[PDB]
């Protein structure tokens, strides 16, 4: 009858396509290309002028639906996959742009973790979404997301970018156009993403502990490979640096916090009957989880933290299984929204319509009244 | 008669070369039609330092490339390496451009400055070319492009009249 | 003898060209600093600027004579100011070789590509046109069989096209 639209906005990338198709049609990055502009500006931003955001969202949606969808969304429904705890200011702006400017029939602002759970096809699961800005945890038990049990450290893609920028600046080796360290003050983000995808090798638990021991009073430094760059300035990036950048994601000491500890804190907050099913079904999604050799380092670190005396008195013996999804780790949240929209013309009714928005005021966020 | 060919410009292969009425070949131009023919449209303005080279020998046993072409009101910008491109009428080539092997430029096109049109790149009608690797930037306006081409043709005719021999 | 040197093309200083070499119209071959060396079957296209680096300093000498390899297809408007080149190297149009270089055999430089000063390009690797030193796209340009056969076909088409141009006159 009518295949609905699926959107999954974010600061780094944006998964978008049709509901029903196994995986999206395209994934253009969040930034936009403007005429007479030095650098490309990011679309998804927080704490900034309302009318400017509205114009930025219109500009991104306009370049999206022609290239991605090849259709007017005026014919059929939309599924805007907002991550839970995405600012209400930003949701209101999205609601305005979809109804006032474009005039869609319906919209939906559903959470990312519940839809990622629909892909697995199980009702209870602990979920971790390691995106660009934050690494958010949220356990779901029998459909309902357990909200007060949660956690989100500023330790996703953006933290890894900042650490790469710091460590490369400290130890730099650029070719002539050899020596000459710290010539350029900063480096672009698109290049630094390509370095993370290709170079950064994720270490094991025993290797990670050896690196942590070396930092505070050297084993397994290799391997190292150079990275090519434009304008005839190749830089000889090292092997110990990229491993040290990955290590800060799992660094426990002096914060009592990490990607692994965040699941345990979420499990601690959850009730006793819910506890065991969440431990059995531990789902990992998001952008940072696509890194090579990540799921072992997490599961081994999780287990090491359970062996510690502080978590034995509550958790103890637990079968931590990581049931992986059908689609890739970044594109699990989108696939869930595509499942939610395509199949059920019935569950399209619960979402907010154009008729309801004009008279009322806004889509209902999880708040009072 | 009306075609204002400059003194510094060179037109190798006069029989193969072809210049329509109201043309304008700027200084230091190179219309090399030794191997193959070169067809220029009416009111076409070839800017300075433009290398109009022939695409192929046309002696290949199978799949010989198309020599050269240029539609009417063609605004060829300066330093533009035009080679093996069938330019549709009213095509606006950018400055420091580069055309590929058998590249089909459509009517009312707008090639950007410092562009590189690849081999067998069929550009669509009423569309701005963009990117380091050739791609569709956005749809161009019909009225604005026609008015700019008319203004460029009038300005080229004034320079064609005086100060070149 | 036995090299298609055009009348409009300019040569200067010492320049020893190989057999079946094709110097196109308005091609600059300024070899005043050092003795230029062109390989056999090397096609220099129109508007090309062949320069040399001033050399012979006692401590850290700057350069030596730019030796171009055999079957090297230099495209139109290509800059080659002091760069060591290998056999079967296809430099695209509007390119720019660095002040010192070591372009290996079976190469394929992109259009509008700035080749690096003091940078040796590896054997079998096609350069992307825009941002310099792009590692991607080096399979179809293999070091041989794939690129050696393609360069042999390119040398045959260049020789056939030059023979047709020489026949026309």
In the DSSP assignment, the letter for residue A40 is P
Homologous superfamily of B1-165: Hexapeptide repeat proteins (2.160.10.10)
| B-chain residues near C76 (CB < 8 A) | 51, 53, 81, 83
| A-chain residues near C131 (CB < 8 A) | 229-231
Mutate to test the interface with A, among C119, C129, C130 (most CBs of A within 10 A): C119
Q: Chain C 137-166, CB below 8 Å of chain A: which residues? A: none
In the DSSP assignment, the letter for residue C159 is H
Q: CA-CA distance, A185 to A165, in Å (whole number)?
A: 10
Contact C25 B56 (CB under 8 A): no
Angle between helices A259-269 and A295-307 (to 10 degrees): 50
A273 — contact with chain C (CB < 8 Å)? no
DSSP letters of A58-120? HHHHHHHHHHTT-S-TTSS-EEEEPPTT--HHHHHHHHHIIIIII--SB--EE-HHHHHHHHH
Q: CA-CA distance, C68 to B108, in Å (whole number)?
A: 43
- Is residue A192 within a helix (H) or strand (E), and if so which, with residue range? helix A189-198
- Two structure tokens written together for A194: 């390509």
| Nearest in space to B84 (alpha carbons), one of B72, B96, B95, B100 | B100
Query: Which residue among C8, C25, C164 sits closest to B59, beta carbon to beta carbon?
Result: C164
Q: CA-CA distance, B13 to B32, in Å (whole number)?
A: 7
Cβ neighbours of residue C148 under 8 Å, at least 6 residues apart?
Answer: C88, C106, C142
Distinct helix (H) and strand (E) counts, chain B? 1, 15
Query: Which residue among A229, A231, A234 sits closest to C114, beta carbon to beta carbon?
Result: A231
Find the radius of gyration of the CA atoms of chain B.
15
Neighbours of chain A (3+ CB pairs under 8 A): C
Contact C25 B12 (CB under 8 A): yes
Contact C132 A232 (CB under 8 A): yes
Angle between helices A239-247 and A157-170 (to 10 degrees): 140
Mutate to test the interface with C, among B16, B29, B33, B57 (most CBs of C within 10 A): B57
Angle at B79 between CA C161 and CA C135, to 5 degrees: 70
B148 — contact with chain C (CB < 8 Å)? no
A228 — contact with chain C (CB < 8 Å)? yes
Q: CA-CA distance, B108 to B91, in Å (whole number)?
A: 5
How far off is chain A from C143, nearest CA to CA, in Å?
A: 20
Q: Chain A 32-61, CB below 8 Å of chain C: which residues? A: none
- Two structure tokens written together for A122: 């199980």
* Strand pairing class (A135-141; A125-130): antiparallel
Contact A232 C133 (CB under 8 A): yes
Instruction: Give the number of C-alpha atoms closer than 13 A to the C-alpha of residue C87, restricted to the C-beta side.
Output: 10
How far off is chain C from A169, nearest CA to CA, in Å?
A: 21
Query: Which residue among C115, C130, C134 sits closest to A228, beta carbon to beta carbon?
Result: C134
List residues of chain C with CB under 8 Å from any CB of chain B: 8, 25-26, 46-47, 76-77, 93-94, 111-112, 129-130, 160-161, 164-165, 168
- Name the structure determination technique: cryo-EM
Ramachandran angles phi, psi of C50, nearest 5° = -90, 105
Ranges of each domain in chain B: 1-165
Q: C1-169 architecture in CATH?
A: 3 Solenoid (2.160)
Contact C130 B53 (CB under 8 A): no
Alpha-carbon dihedral sign for residues C129, C131, C135, C136: negative
Burial class (CB in 10 A: 0-12, 13-18, 19+), B83: buried
How far off is chain A from C99, nearest CA to CA, in Å?
A: 9
How far is residue A43 from each of residues A32, A194, A369, C77, measured CA to CA in Å? 7, 20, 31, 41
- How many interface pairs between A and C have CB atoms less than 8 angstroms apart? 36
Q: CA-CA distance, A269 to A272, in Å (whole number)?
A: 9
| Nearest in space to A199 (alpha carbons), one of A217, A172, A223 | A223
Ranges of each domain in chain C: 1-169
Q: CA-CA distance, A142 to A289, in Å (whole number)?
A: 25
Burial class (CB in 10 A: 0-12, 13-18, 19+), C158: buried
Contact A228 C117 (CB under 8 A): no
| B-chain residues near C46 (CB < 8 A) | 30, 32, 51, 53
Contact C161 B35 (CB under 8 A): yes
Instruction: Identify the three-state secondary structure at position A214.
Output: helix
Query: Which residue among C117, C134, C135 sits closest to A177, beta carbon to beta carbon?
Result: C117
B62 — contact with chain C (CB < 8 Å)? no
Neighbours of chain B (3+ CB pairs under 8 A): C
Burial class (CB in 10 A: 0-12, 13-18, 19+), A122: middle
B56 — contact with chain C (CB < 8 Å)? yes
In the DSSP assignment, the letter for residue A250 is G
Contact C132 A230 (CB under 8 A): yes
**Residues of the domain holding A234:** 157-249
Spell C65-83 as b/e; 16+ CB within 10 A means b: bbebbbbbbbbbbbbbbbb
Domain of residue A176, CATH code = 3.90.640.10
Alpha-carbon dihedral sign for residues A305, A308, A311, A312: positive
Mutate to test the interface with C, among B28, B31, B35 (most CBs of C within 10 A): B35
Query: Which residue among C77, C130, C168 sits closest to B132, beta carbon to beta carbon?
Result: C130
Cβ neighbours of residue B125 under 8 Å, at least 6 residues apart?
Answer: B88, B106, B107, B108, B109
| C-chain residues near B130 (CB < 8 A) | none
Q: What is the resolution of this structure in A?
A: 4.0
Find the radius of gyration of the CA atoms of chain A.
22
Instruction: Identify the three-state secondary structure at position C8.
Output: coil
Query: Which residue among C26, C111, C165 sits closest to B35, beta carbon to beta carbon?
Result: C165
| A-chain residues near C112 (CB < 8 A) | none
| C-chain residues near A199 (CB < 8 A) | none
Tell the residue number behind the tokens 């070319």, with chain if given. Answer: B129
Cis peptide before A3 (omega within 30 of 0): no
Q: Mind spelling out the 3-state secondary structure of B4-46?
A: EECCCCECCCCCCEEECCCCEECCCCEECCCCCCEEECCCCEE
Q: CA-CA distance, C163 to B3, in Å (whole number)?
A: 33
């Amino acid at each position: 009858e009518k295949t609905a639209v699926v959107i999954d906005l974010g600061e780094a990338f944006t998964k978008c396509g049709f509901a029903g198709e196994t995986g999206p049609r395209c994934i253009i990055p969040s930034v936009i290309k403007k005429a007479g502009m030095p650098k490309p500006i990011k679309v998804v931003q927080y704490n900034i002028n309302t009318e400017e955001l509205y114009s930025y969202l219109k500009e991104f949606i306009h370049i999206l639906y022609f290239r991605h969808l090849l259709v007017n969304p005026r014919d059929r429904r939309v599924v805007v996959i907002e991550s839970v705890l995405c600012p209400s200011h930003f949701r209101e702006t999205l609601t305005r742009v979809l109804f006032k400017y474009f005039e869609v029939p319906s919209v939906l602002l559903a959470p990312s973790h519940l839809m990622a759970l629909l892909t697995l096809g199980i009702n209870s699961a602990m979920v971790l979404d390691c995106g660009y800005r934050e690494s958010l945890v949220l356990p779901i038990y029998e459909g309902i997301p357990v909200l007060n049990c949660w956690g989100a450290l500023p330790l996703g893609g953006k933290a890894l970018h900042k650490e790469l920028e710091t460590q490369l600046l400290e130890q730099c080796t650029v070719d002539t156009g050899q020596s000459l360290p710290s010539v350029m003050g900063s480096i672009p983000e698109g290049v630094l993403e390509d370095i993370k995808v290709r170079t950064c090798f994720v270490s094991d638990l025993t290797r990670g502990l050896k690196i942590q021991a070396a930092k505070f009073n050297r084993p397994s430094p290799p391997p190292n490979v150079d990275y090519p760059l434009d304008g005839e300035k190749i830089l000889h990036v090292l092997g110990s640096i990229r491993d040290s950048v990955v290590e800060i994601l799992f660094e426990q000491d002096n914060e009592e916090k990490s990607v692994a500890t965040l699941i345990l804190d979420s499990l601690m907050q959850c009730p006793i009957d819910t506890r065991k099913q969440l431990a059995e079904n531990l789902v990992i999604i998001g952008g940072t989880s696509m890194l090579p050799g990540f799921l072992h380092r997490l599961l081994a670190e999780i287990r090491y933290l359970v062996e510690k005396p502080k978590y034995k008195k509550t958790l103890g013996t637990k079968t931590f299984r990581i049931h992986t999804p059908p689609a890739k780790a970044n594109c699990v949240a989108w696939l869930g929204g595509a499942i939610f929209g395509a199949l059920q013309d019935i569950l399209g009714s619960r979402s907010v319509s154009k008729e309801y928005y004009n008279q009322t005021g806004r889509i209902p966020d999880w708040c009072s009244l | 008669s009306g075609n204002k060919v400059s003194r510094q410009s060179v037109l190798c292969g006069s029989q193969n070369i072809v210049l329509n009425g109201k043309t304008i070949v700027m200084n230091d131009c190179i219309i090399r039609g030794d191997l193959a023919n070169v067809r220029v449209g009416r009111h076409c303005v070839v800017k300075s330092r433009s290398v109009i080279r022939p695409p192929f020998k046309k002696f290949s046993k199978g799949v010989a490339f198309f020599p050269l072409h240029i539609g009417d009101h063609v605004f060829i910008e300066e330093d533009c390496v035009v080679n093996a491109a069938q330019i549709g009428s009213y095509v606006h080539v950018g400055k420091n451009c580069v055309i590929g092997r058998r590249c089909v430029l459509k009517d009312c096109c707008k090639i950007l400055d410092n562009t590189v049109l690849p081999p067998e790149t069929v550009v669509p009608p009423f569309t701005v070319f963009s990117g380091c690797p050739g791609l569709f930037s956005g749809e161009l306006p019909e009225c604005t492009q026609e008015l700019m081409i008319d203004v460029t043709k009038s300005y080229y005719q004034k320079f064609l009249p005086l100060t070149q021999v | 003898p036995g090299a298609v040197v055009c009348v409009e093309s300019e040569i200067r200083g010492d320049v020893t060209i190989g057999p079946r070499t094709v110097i196109h119209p308005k091609a600059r071959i300024i070899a005043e600093a050092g003795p230029i060396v062109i390989g056999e079957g090397n096609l220099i296209e129109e508007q090309a600027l062949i320069i040399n680096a001033h050399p012979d300093n006692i401590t850290p000498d700057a350069e030596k004579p730019m030796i171009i390899g055999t079957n090297n297809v230099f495209e139109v408007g290509c800059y080659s100011q002091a760069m060591k080149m290998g056999d079967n190297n296809v430099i695209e149009s509007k390119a720019y070789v660095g002040r010192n270089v070591i372009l290996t055999s079976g190469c394929i430089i992109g259009a509008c590509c700035n080749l690096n000063t003091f940078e040796v390009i590896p054997e079998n690797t096609v350069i992307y046109g825009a941002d310099c030193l792009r590692r991607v796209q080096t399979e179809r340009p293999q070091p041989q069989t794939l690129q050696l056969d393609f360069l042999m076909k390119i040398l045959p088409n260049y020789h056939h096209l030059k023979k047709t141009m020489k026949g026309s006159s």
